[PDB]
Symmetry: C3
Subunit: 33 residues, 3 copies
């Protein structure tokens, strides 16, 4: 159960990082995004 | 403690999904968003 | 392991909240964002 929770948390960390990058690009207009 | 952690993780998964949908709409201008 | 998982989850909660605020601002054009 715990190891599956860690795997869920690791996946959330990657998704959250992807979202931060996308939001920063929208906020700053990087490369016309 | 663990069951509460799972419940926290399940809630984060739903929020992260909501954020992905909103960010994709901003990125692609869907329906004028 | 569990206490470290909680600490990871607490950090994800803060990041997710930051992302919600930023996305809401982009969506609504608050203060010209």
């Amino acid at each position: 159960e715990v190891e599956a929770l860690e795997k869920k948390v690791e996946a959330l960390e990657f998704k959250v990082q992807k979202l931060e990058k996308k939001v920063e690009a929208l906020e700053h207009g990087w490369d016309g995004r």
